[PDB]
Amino acid sequence: PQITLWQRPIVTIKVGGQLREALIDTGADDTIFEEINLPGRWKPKLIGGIGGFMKVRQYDQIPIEICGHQAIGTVLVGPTPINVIGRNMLTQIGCTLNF
Amino acid sequence: PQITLWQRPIVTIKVGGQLREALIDTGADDTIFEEINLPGRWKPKLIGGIGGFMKVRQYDQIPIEICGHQAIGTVLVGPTPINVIGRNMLTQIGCTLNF
Numbered sequence: 001p002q003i004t005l006w007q008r009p010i011v012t013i014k015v016g017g018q019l020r021e022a023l024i025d026t027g028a029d030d031t032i033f034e035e036i037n038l039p040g041r042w043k044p045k046l047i048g049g050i051g052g053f054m055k056v057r058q059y060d061q062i063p064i065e066i067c068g069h070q071a072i073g074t075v076l077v078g079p080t081p082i083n084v085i086g087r088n089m090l091t092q093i094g095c096t097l098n099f
Numbered sequence: 100p101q102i103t104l105w106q107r108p109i110v111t112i113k114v115g116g117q118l119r120e121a122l123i124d125t126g127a128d129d130t131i132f133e134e135i136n137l138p139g140r141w142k143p144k145l146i147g148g149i150g151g152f153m154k155v156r157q158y159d160q161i162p163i164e165i166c167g168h169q170a171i172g173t174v175l176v177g178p179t180p181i182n183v184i185g186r187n188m189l190t191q192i193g194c195t196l197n198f
């Protein structure tokens with residue numbers, strides 16, 4: 001779809017067999033969720049944002065469905081105030097900006 | 100223009116008579132710059148992101164040029180790791196997401 005920006009661009013996600021909502025975030029390089037439970041091995045990672053850094057778990061090659069579109073890629077899990085879909089996933093679903 | 104997401108969506112800005120680069124950020128409600136010098140009165144504000152909060156100065160009704168498009172609105176000034184154009188400004192320039 002086309003999504004305008006009068007409201008936060010929140011969409012419905014399926015990841016790890018669980019349903020969540022997440023913000024389409026062109027300012028995020030990576031994809032971050034709080035409170036999902038993903039299977040298998042992970043690596044600890046520190047990431048930076050406004051207000052400093054955050055410790056996350058890094059999971060690789062995770063399938064995700066983003067507003068009905070399929071992608072696979074790295075998902076970070078940690079205490080983000082809102083779930084975000086970043087460019088690693090947005091490029092796979094053909095998402096662009098336009099003005 | 101249309102902007103794809105293979106790279107960070109960075110554009111050229113003029114604000115307060117100064118030239119800067121900033122990220123088109125659909126996950127940002129507000130617009131934040133580091134190291135600009137804006138005129139007039141401001142109000143201190145605490146804002147939240149990943150990794151916690153940040154103290155900013157809030158300036159209202161600031162003119163800005165975003166990739167050649169004119170807007171006016173609130174600009175926050177404080178120690179962001181990258182300058183961001185948020186939805187308060189993006190709606191004025193007709194920016195949309197599309198997939």
Ligand SMILES: CC(C)CN(C[C@@H](O)[C@H](Cc1cccc(F)c1)NC(=O)O[C@H]1[C@H]2CO[C@H]3OC[C@@H]1[C@H]3C2)S(=O)(=O)c1ccc2nc(NC3CC3)sc2c1
Pocket residue numbers: 025026027028029030031032047048049050080081082084086122124125126127128129130146147148149150181183185
């Ligand atoms: C700050 C930008 C540049 C980056 N962030 C993406 C922005 O869109 C975040 C999303 C958000 C919204 C709300 C609360 C939040 F906690 C977070 N917006 C944000 O903080 O807005 C703030 C600020 C603007 O006005 C209002 O609107 C929401 C809130 C409030 C004050 S990020 O989440 O830190 C992130 C994401 C992925 C990523 N992947 C990385 N990988 C390695 C480097 C390669 S680093 C990295 C860092």
